[PDB]
Symmetry: none
Subunit: 122 residues, 3 copies
Amino acid sequence: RDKFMDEFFKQVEEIRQYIDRIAENVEEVARQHQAILASPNPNWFDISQLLWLMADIKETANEVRKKLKEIEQSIEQEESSADLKIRKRQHEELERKFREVMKEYNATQQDYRKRARKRNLE
Amino acid sequence: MRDKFMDEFFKQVEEIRQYIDRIAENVEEVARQHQAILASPNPNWFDISQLLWLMADIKETANEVRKKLKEIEQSIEQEEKSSADLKIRKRQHEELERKFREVMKEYNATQQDYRKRARKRNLE
Amino acid sequence: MRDKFMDEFFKQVEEIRQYIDRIAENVEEVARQHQAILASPNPNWFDISQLLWLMADIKETANEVRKKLKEIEQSIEQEEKSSADLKIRKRQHEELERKFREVMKEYNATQQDYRKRARKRNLE
C-alpha cells in the first residue's frame, strides 16, 4: 500500500498542476477574446494565440481525464479502508475542480461567440 | 491467442472509424464556416477563430488516423494464401484507407472552393 | 555505448534542422500573405484565414524546436574539460540556437512591418 499510495499522491499532484494550467489558460483565453474584439483591426497574433491556448487546453484536459479515469478504475478494483476513502474523497474533489474549470471555459467561449456576433452587427 | 488480438484489432478499427466520422463532421462545419464568412457584409472574428479551430482539429485527427492505419499496415506485412483472419484484417484496412482518402479529398475540395469563392467575393 | 547515442544525437539535429527550414518557408509565405492582404482594397478571407493558419504552424513548430533543443541542452548539462563528443554536441546546439533565433527574428520583423504598413494604408 505505502508504495501504491505514494504513487497515488504523485498522480494527484500532477492532476492539480494540470488543472491550474487549464485555469490559467482560461483566464488568458478571456484576455485574447477581449483583445480581439476591442480593436478595430485585431492583431493577427491575437487570433493565432487564442488557437494555441485552446489546443493546449484540449491536450491538458485529455490528460486530466485519462489520469482521473486511471484512479477511478483503481478505486473500483479495491472496492472500506482509510486509504480507499482517501482516494475516493480526493478523486471526487479533483473531478469537481476539473468540471468547474471546463464549465468556465465553455462560458468564456459562448460569450466570445455572442459578442463577436454583436460586433459584426454593429 | 488470436482471439485476443482480433478483438483488439476490431477495437482499433472502431477507434479509426470514430476519428474518420469526426473528420467528416468537421469538414461539414468547415463548409458552414466558409459560407457564414463569405455571406456576411462584415468580419466576424468568432467565425474566423472557429474555422481555424476546425482545421487544427482535422489536422490533429488525421495524423492519428494515418498513424493508427500505419500501425495496422505494419502488423499485416509482418504476419503476411493469407489465412481467413489475415484476409479480414487486410480487407478492413483497405476499406478504412478508402474512406479516409475520401473524407480528406472532400476537405481539400472544400478548401479549393473557399479559396476560389473568397477571390470572387473580394472582387465584388 | 556512446556510438548509438551520437547517432541518435545527429538524427535529432537533422530533425531540428528540418523544423527550422519549415519555419523559414512559412515565414516567406507569411510575407506573401502580407503582400496580398495589403495590395487588396478589400478583404480576402482566404488570404486572412491562410495567414492565420501559417502563424499557427510557425508557433507549433517553433515550440517543438524549443523542446527538442531543451532536451539536448539538458543532456549536455548532466554530462558536463569536456570530451570531444560533448564538445561536438555543444557546438551544434549553439549553432542550432543561433539559426532558430535568426528565423524567429525574421518572423517578428515581418509581423512588425505588416502592422506598420497596414496602419499607413488605413490612413490613406
